[PDB]
Amino acid sequence: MYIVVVYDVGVERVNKVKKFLRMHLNWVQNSVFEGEVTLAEFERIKEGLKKIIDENSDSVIIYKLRSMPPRETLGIEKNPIEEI
Amino acid sequence: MYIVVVYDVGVERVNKVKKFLRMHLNWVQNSVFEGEVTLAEFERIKEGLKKIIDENSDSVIIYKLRSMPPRETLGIEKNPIEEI
């Protein structure tokens, strides 16, 4: 399993979720992280993110892919594909 | 082809790219659009987005998938899966 996590979280609560995912997935651009995970770690990411975030206000989308998808990037590549 | 477009564009230039993608793809959450496209329309989205945005500063990631990926959403679903 491979997932791309994109999120819209109000400031002064974003930095919090950012720190969290930085220890689970790779940071692609602002508000975007992706990486491989185990059916267990996947539950853990969403587990913590479930309380590290405030529903009703924030939004988090977690696409569930089978492998690292190809991508086309414009502008300053927030992170070299190789570096991950 | 199906793509998920995520972007980080400075304000007062974001609204511009937002209007553009709203006429090409579906809006999932803030800074995220996805939808099906033809090898032609795909070139068109990135074509316009290529000049509707300022490199060196902005960042745009366009994942290239074969079909609408499954997703897990937390918080206020910025848009019902069915509504698209």
The domain total for chain B is 1
Query: Is B72 contained in some domain?
Result: no
Angle at A33 between CA A78 and CA A45, to 5 degrees: 160
Contact (CB<8Å) A62/B74? yes
Q: Minimal Cα distance from B77: which residue of A?
A: A59
Give the range of the structural domain holding residue B51, as residue numbers without chain letter.
1-66
Solving technique for this entry? Answer: X-ray
> Could you tell me the end-to-end alpha-carbon distance of chain A, in angstroms, rounded to an integer?
17
Contact (CB<8Å) B29/A72? no
CA-to-CA separations, A16 to A23, A42, A59, B44, in angstroms, rounded: 12, 18, 14, 37
A4 touches chain B (CB under 8 A): yes
Residue A29 is encoded by which pair of tokens? 């651009």
Size of interface A-B (CB pairs under 8 A): 114
Determine how β-strand A59-65 pairs with β-strand A26-29: unpaired
DSSP state of B24: T
- Chain A residues inside the 8 Å CB shell of B78: 8, 59
Residue in B28, B53, B62 nearest the CB of A61: B28
A2 vs A8: CA distance, rounded Å: 20
Strand, helix or coil at A43? helix
Nearest of B78, B81, B83, B68 to residue B29 by alpha carbon:
B78
Give the residues across from A63 on adjacent strands.
A4, B71
Contact (CB<8Å) B75/A65? no
CATH number of domain containing A47 = 3.30.70.240
Query: Is B5 contained in some domain?
Result: yes
Query: Is A1 contained in some domain?
Result: yes
Query: Is A79 contained in some domain?
Result: no
A44 vs A81: CA distance, rounded Å: 25
Q: By the 8 A CB rule, do A61 and A23 touch?
A: no
Query: Is A75 contained in some domain?
Result: no
Residue B20 is encoded by which pair of tokens? 């553009």
Q: Which residues of B are annotated as a binding site for Mg(2+)?
A: 8
Q: By the 8 A CB rule, do B6 and A31 touch?
A: yes
Q: Minimal Cα distance from A61: which residue of B?
A: B73
Residue A78 is encoded by which pair of tokens? 């927030």
Q: Which residues of B are annotated as a binding site?
A: 8
Residue B33 is encoded by which pair of tokens? 């659009």
Query: Is B76 contained in some domain?
Result: no
CA torsion through residues B10, B13, B15, B18, sign: negative
Q: By the 8 A CB rule, do A20 and A49 touch?
A: yes
Residue A54, marked binder: no
Query: Is B57 contained in some domain?
Result: yes
Query: Is B40 contained in some domain?
Result: yes
DSSP state of B48: H
